[PDB]
UniProtKB/Swiss-Prot annotation, chain A:
This is Antigen peptide transporter 1. Belongs to the ABC transporter superfamily. ABCB family. MHC peptide exporter (TC 3.A.1.209) subfamily. Residues 36-55, 148-156, 268-271 are lumenal. Its cofactor is Mg(2+). Keywords: Adaptive immunity, ATP-binding, Endoplasmic reticulum, Host-virus interaction, Immunity, Magnesium, Membrane, Metal-binding, Nucleotide-binding, Peptide transport, Protein transport, Translocase, Transmembrane, Transmembrane helix, Transport. The gene is TAP1. It catalyses: a peptide antigen(in) + ATP + H2O = a peptide antigen(out) + ADP + phosphate + H(+). The chain holds residues 173 to 742 of 748 of the full protein. ABC transporter associated with antigen processing. In complex with TAP2 mediates unidirectional translocation of peptide antigens from cytosol to endoplasmic reticulum (ER) for loading onto MHC class I (MHCI) molecules. Uses the chemical energy of ATP to export peptides against the concentration gradient. During the transport cycle alternates between 'inward-facing' state with peptide binding site facing the cytosol to 'outward-facing' state with peptide binding site facing the ER lumen. Highly expressed in professional APCs monocytes and dendritic cells as well as in lymphocyte subsets T cells, B cells and NK cells.
Swiss-Prot record, chain B:
This is Antigen peptide transporter 2. It is linked to MHC class I deficiency 2: An autosomal recessive, progressive disorder characterized by chronic bacterial infections of the upper and lower respiratory tract apparent in the first or second decades of life, nasal polyps, and ulcers with granulomatous inflammation affecting the nasal cavity, upper respiratory tract, or skin. Patients may develop bronchiectasis and respiratory failure. Belongs to the ABC transporter superfamily. ABCB family. MHC peptide exporter (TC 3.A.1.209) subfamily. Residues 171-259, 284-303 are annotated as: Part of the peptide-binding site. It is a multi-pass membrane protein. The gene is TAP2. It is found in: Endoplasmic reticulum membrane. Changing residue 521 to C: In allele TAP2*01:03 and allele TAP2*01G. Residues 40-57, 158-163, 266-278 are lumenal. Its main location: endoplasmic reticulum. It comes from Homo sapiens (Human). The lineage of its organism: Eukaryota, Metazoa, Chordata, Craniata, Vertebrata. GO terms for molecular function: ABC-type peptide antigen transporter activity; ABC-type peptide transporter activity; ATP binding; ATP hydrolysis activity; metal ion binding; MHC class Ib protein binding; peptide antigen binding; peptide transmembrane transporter activity. The peptide-binding site is shared between the cytoplasmic loops of TAP1 and TAP2. The nucleotide-binding domain (NBD) mediates ATP hydrolysis coupled to peptide translocation. Two ATP molecules are accommodated at distinct nucleotide binding sites (NBS) at TAP1-TAP2 dimer interface. Each NBS is formed by Walker A (GxxGxGKST) and Q-loop motifs from NBD of one subunit, while the NBD from the second subunit completes the active site by contributing the C loop motif (LSGGQ). Each ATP molecule is coordinated via the beta- and gamma-phosphates to a Mg2+ ion, which is necessary for ATP hydrolysis. ATP binds at residues 373-380. It catalyses: a peptide antigen(in) + ATP + H2O = a peptide antigen(out) + ADP + phosphate + H(+).
Length: 570, 551
């Protein structure tokens, strides 16, 4: 379509040079038969030898130049094709990565977007060379037609007239063979189906000892397909015979009409020899074009799939432009109600309203489910609220710049992922500026991960494989905490970061939450199952069914004697 | 690597009974090649005739011979193609039938272990590849060899000096091809490694997207992907440059040999030992000869590469069944005394986990023996062991003071029959499924069996009576109708030992019991399986089986 020309237009300076080289090489590669005919005619006229050596040198020079020009043009085309293929791959990946989280939560189809991009590889090659093979040949054919027409218009007119009669008749004949093949395939499928049906009930076919019956019923099916096979063979034989004789008789016809022309005196024998040598190459070029065309047709037909991912509209608000240099970190919820866009019939959150202020720790507690992690997912702008408002320092989340907002708010999830790279890169993941070693050591000390980092033989540069199989759960929790603590965030979410951790890590977290000197510039939302950390929190929020029922400090909730009291007693 | 050699020997032995077709196809191929290769020689003769003084008779004769040879070559080519396609189809049919017949004799454990889809894939796909393997490769090899021999014979006929000049070309081409392939293999390995490394980053980024979006590191992954794509593109360009250089050197060599041959031929024609038509025919032959010798030198690898799609089916045919040798006891004295002595069974698919713990009981001809127990106790296993579908791991079974495995396979199942727990129906008609496993029968016996099983009430509602067609896997009748049909199918044979694994049945088996005491006739041993003790209560002998132990 027009999109291929649009993405190929950035190089229409090199493509013109490639086309010029191609036409020059095609012109120069055909001097061999012409000079053969000329030199043979000169021998028959017993001429001189200076013209002989001159013509030999000229033909050699022309052929050498043709080969060199073909090589140079092929190199230029390959270089440009590789460049545009790399650009297209980068563009399609960048377009895929911009879609909203609702597109990516279908992890059961995750490999699809791990495959479609790779499809853009195997498609592009299927279009990279075939389009060359077409383009390298058609002009070549057009070159040959430019010489035989100069030789004698009658013979080239004859071969042009009878070319379709030899290159379309087998196509018309092959329909019979193809339909017979389809019938044979369907009969074989039916026989295989009845064989599978017989085989799937082995206990009940052995209980009556009827294996001979199944053998007979399977032979009976093949006895019918034998006749279809015979008809298939006859049709194939007829197709082969016609596709042979139609192409073979053209040479005899050309020789007859050329002999008539030569006896008439219009042309000489050398022209006939050159025409005979040119006709085979012309036929080969035409056959190559006919073979090439369906493949490029299939490629351009299948190219429409990639553009679907390329221009898919994201269902998410655009990034804002706000980037203040001073954030207090106050977070307000105003009657927030959220339903998952995958199944928007269920309201997971309803009537949520609370305020987080710097220097104060808010502990969110509740049973399994009940949208505990959904509030954390909403807080870091991973989803948009169906109803209500989320306010950060008096401004909504989408109004902020994407990178700045995600730098100012940090979260530790239930199951932290660790990518495969150096260990000190995982600590500073996503940072715009590479931090110093002192900052990474300070972050490791704050999270307590520095105890076992120095025990590694490679230190902070220990490579990690995929999925973090080289580390235990507690080490992964420590590295995730240190990664979330490196940027000094304004709003810290710790959701299930105290589940499978060491006691030393628990002590480090407890010290960071309450007795750390830098807590005053931080607002913490803590989700945990340990009552010791919960009791020291300033505000406690109980979540059940996506609604807030019990709220206040620990003493007030103890005096309430409600759900939190039962949880404490349990 | 002798596995491929023995596989190809097996394929040749399988295709052995198609000798005349292959011989005729080879003869037609030789005729077609010989007829085709004469065309440029007669073209050269015509060209030589046209020069100099004219002679219409020679011209007409040459054109007539050209037409005749073209007609003969086309006819032979068509016949060869037809013969090869027919032998393809014959090989396919023979191998399909052989595989099915071999698979039909396996033990039950093999079918329990394997899957129906895998068997369908092996039967319906690999046989076509086996059929296509031999005649296609044979045609290619024979065509290449005959073409090479004929073309070089014609070179020798025209002029030997130019033939030697042409033959001087090959070794440089062979060496260049080998060197290019050796470098290309390493380049391809590097390409594969680089593309795997490039795909790793996109897989990792698309996996954990929530953590990526949490930290806003979306453009970083794009930059890393671009960095990987740069190395991939560099390796691609290096590979393309190597290929272009190889093509250039091949073209230069071909040009050199062509120019040398043309110069030598012109020098020879100047001396008077050649003619214009002979030179033209020699050029045509020289153009034609190269691809055939290339195919000839690559055909061994091409043929050996495709054999690796037929070893699975040969292994399936070569699998040894785990069954005892059949007996040869077919007596007419089969009053129906059945004994189980210390029978303990373990499933071969899941060994060392026995379900039977030393059963021992006796059956009687005229009386009724019922077996009761809870779900999962394993009464169906007792029925299967009584039907000689499995062998006991301990103790023995006796049928009229003879082991059951020493009876004839066809005779035993005509006397000891069983209505199964879940009846299975086939795609045949009602009459075909009622008389399943029977070579011949009469309509009266089928009608009597339908009346005895209380299945004749609904047998007249459908068209054509008992000859009514049934859907695939019996997907046309109700569950009660299927149960009645199965009961009639069992009762057709008029057995002596009758097992009725009712268990989960909804045919109001109270009617079956009220029919005639669970089909007991006083000379036929009956073993009826029931879920609850209260459902039968009239059996002369009652056995309760708990956890593989009798009570
Ligand atoms: N993508 C989704 N689409 C629809 N519903 C979802 C989706 N992800 C989670 N849920 C459901 O929404 C609720 C969110 O619960 P949430 O994950 O916050 O609970 P939790 O207490 O943190 O722990 P857990 O994950 O063990 O339930 C659950 O009922 C969950 O099954
Ligand atoms: N093909 C098999 N391979 C391995 N183990 C099997 C197989 N079929 C059944 N079993 C197991 O062997 C025992 C036989 O159970 P079986 O089905 O015969 O019980 P049953 O008492 O006849 O009752 P019902 O069939 O109505 O459930 C069970 O423990 C079952 O799980």
């Amino acid at each position: 379509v027009r999109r291929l020309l649009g993405c190929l237009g950035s190089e229409t300076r090199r493509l013109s040079l490639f086309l010029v080289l191609v036409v020059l090489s095609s012109l120069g590669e055909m001097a061999i038969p012409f000079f053969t005919g000329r030199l043979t005619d000169w021998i028959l006229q017993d001429g001189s030898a200076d013209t002989f050596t001159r013509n030999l040198t000229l033909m050699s020079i022309l052929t050498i130049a043709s080969a060199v020009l073909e090589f140079v043009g092929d190199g230029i085309y390959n270089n440009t094709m590789g460049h545009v293929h790399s650009h297209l791959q980068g563009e399609v990946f960048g377009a895929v990565l911009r879609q909203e989280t609702e597109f990516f939560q279908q992890n059961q189809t995750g490999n699809i977007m791990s495959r479609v991009t790779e499809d853009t590889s195997t498609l592009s090659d299927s279009l990279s060379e075939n389009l060359s093979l077409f383009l390298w040949y058609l002009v070549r054919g057009l070159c040959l037609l430019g010489i035989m027409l100069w030789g004698s218009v009658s013979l080239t007119m004859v071969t042009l007239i009878t070319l379709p009669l030899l290159f379309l008749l087998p196509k018309k004949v092959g329909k019979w063979y193809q339909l017979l093949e389809v019938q044979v395939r369907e009969s074989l499928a039916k026989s295989s189906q009845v064989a599978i049906e017989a085989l799937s009930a082995m206990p009940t076919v052995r209980s009556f000892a009827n294996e001979e019956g199944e053998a007979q019923k399977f032979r009976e099916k093949l006895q019918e397909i034998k006749t279809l096979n015979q008809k298939e063979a006859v049709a194939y034989a007829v197709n082969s015979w016609t596709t042979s004789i139609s192409g073979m008789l053209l040479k005899v016809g050309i020789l007859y009409i050329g002999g008539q022309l030569v006896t008439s005196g219009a042309v000489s024998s050398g022209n006939l020899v050159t025409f005979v040598l040119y006709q085979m190459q012309f036929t080969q070029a035409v056959e190559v074009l006919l073979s090439i065309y369906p493949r490029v047709q299939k490629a351009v037909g299948s190219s429409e799939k990639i553009f679907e991912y390329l221009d898919r509209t994201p269902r998410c608000p655009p990034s804002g432009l706000l980037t203040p240099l001073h954030l207090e970190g106050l977070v307000q919820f105003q009657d927030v109600s959220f339903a998952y866009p995958n199944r928007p019939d269920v309201l997971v959150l309803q009537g949520l309203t609370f305020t987080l202020r710097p220097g104060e720790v808010t502990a969110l507690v509740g049973p399994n489910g009940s949208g505990k992690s959904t509030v954390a997912a909403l807080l870091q702008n991973l989803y948009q609220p169906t109803g209500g408002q989320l306010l950060l320092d008096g401004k909504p989340l989408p109004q902020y710049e994407h990178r700045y907002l995600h730098r100012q708010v940090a979260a530790v999830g239930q199951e932290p992922q660790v990518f495969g790279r150096s260990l000190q890169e995982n600590i500073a993941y996503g940072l715009t500026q590479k931090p110093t070693m002192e900052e990474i050591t300070a972050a490791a000390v704050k999270s307590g991960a520095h105890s076992f980092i120095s025990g590694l033989p490679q230190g902070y540069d220990t490579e990690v494989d995929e999925a973090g199989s080289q580390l235990s759960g507690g080490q992964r929790q420590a590295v995730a905490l240190a990664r979330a603590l490196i940027r000094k965030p304004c709003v810290l979410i710790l959701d299930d970061a105290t589940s499978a951790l060491d006691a030393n890590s628990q002590l480090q977290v407890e010290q960071l939450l309450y007795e750390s000197p830098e807590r005053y510039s931080r607002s913490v939302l803590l989700i945990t199952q340990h009552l010791s950390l919960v009791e020291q929190a300033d505000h406690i929020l109980f979540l059940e069914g996506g609604a807030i029922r019990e709220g206040g400090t620990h003493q007030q909730l103890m005096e309430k004697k409600g759900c939190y009291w039962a949880m404490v007693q349990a | 690597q002798v596995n491929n050699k023995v596989l190809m020997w097996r394929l040749l032995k399988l295709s052995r009974p198609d000798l005349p077709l292959l011989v005729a196809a080879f003869f037609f191929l030789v005729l077609a090649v010989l007829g085709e290769t004469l065309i440029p020689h007669y073209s050269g003769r015509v060209i030589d005739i046209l020069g100099g003084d004219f002679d219409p008779h020679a011209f007409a004769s040459a054109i007539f011979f050209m037409c005749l040879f073209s007609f003969g070559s086309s006819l032979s080519a068509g016949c060869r193609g037809g013969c090869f396609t027919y032998t393809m189809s014959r090989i396919n049919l023979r191998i399909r039938e052989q595989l099915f017949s071999s698979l039909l004799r396996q033990d039950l454990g093999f079918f329990q272990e394997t899957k129906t889809g895998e068997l369908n894939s092996r039967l319906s796909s690999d046989t076509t590849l086996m059929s296509n393997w031999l005649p296609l490769n044979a045609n290619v090899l024979l065509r290449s060899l005959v073409k090479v021999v004929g073309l070089y014979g014609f070179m020798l006929s025209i002029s030997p000096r130019l033939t030697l000049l042409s033959l001087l070309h090959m070794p440089f081409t062979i060496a260049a091809e080998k060197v290019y392939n050796t470098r290309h293999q390493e380049v391809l390995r590097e390409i594969q490694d680089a593309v795997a490394r490039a795909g790793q980053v996109v897989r990792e980024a698309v996996g954990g997207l929530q953590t990526v979006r949490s930290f806003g590191a979306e453009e970083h992954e794009v930059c890393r992907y671009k960095e990987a794509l740069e190395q991939c593109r560099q390796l691609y360009w290096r590979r393309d440059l190597e290929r272009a250089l190889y093509l250039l050197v091949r073209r230069v060599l071909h040009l050199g040999v062509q120019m040398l041959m043309l110069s030598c031929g012109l020098q020879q024609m100047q001396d008077g030992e050649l003619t214009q038509g002979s030179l033209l025919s020699f050029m045509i032959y020289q153009e034609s000869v190269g691809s055939y010798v290339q195919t000839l030198v690559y055909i061994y690898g091409d043929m050996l590469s495709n054999v690796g799609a037929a070893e699975k089916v040969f292994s399936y045919m070569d699998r040894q069944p785990n069954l005892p040798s059949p007996g040869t006891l077919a007596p007419t004295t089969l009053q129906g005394v059945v004994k189980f002595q210390d029978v303990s069974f373990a499933y071969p698919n899941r060994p060392d986990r026995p379900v039977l713990k030393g059963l021992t009981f006796t059956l009687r001809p005229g009386e009724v023996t019922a077996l009761v127990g809870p779900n999962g106790s394993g009464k169906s296993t007792v029925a299967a062991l009584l039907q000689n579908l499995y062998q006991p791991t301990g103790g023995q079974v006796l049928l009229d003071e003879k082991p059951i495995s020493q009876y004839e396979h066809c005779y035993l199942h005509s006397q000891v029959v069983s209505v199964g727990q879940e009846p299975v129906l086939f795609s045949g008609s009602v009459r075909n499924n009622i008389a399943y496993g029977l070579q011949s029968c009469e309509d009266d016996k089928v009608m009597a069996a339908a009346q005895a099983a209380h299945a004749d009430d609904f047998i007249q509602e459908m068209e054509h009576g008992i000859y009514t067609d049934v859907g695939e896997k019996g997907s046309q009748l109700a569950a009660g109708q299927k149960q009645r049909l199965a009961i009639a199918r069992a009762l057709v044979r008029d057995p002596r030992v009758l097992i009725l694994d009712e268990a989960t049945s909804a045919l109001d088996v109270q009617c079956e019991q009220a029919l005639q005491d669970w089909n007991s006739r006083g000379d036929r041993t009956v073993l009826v399986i029931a879920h609850r003790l209260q459902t039968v209560q009239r059996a002369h002998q009652i056995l309760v089986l708990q956890e593989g132990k009798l009570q």
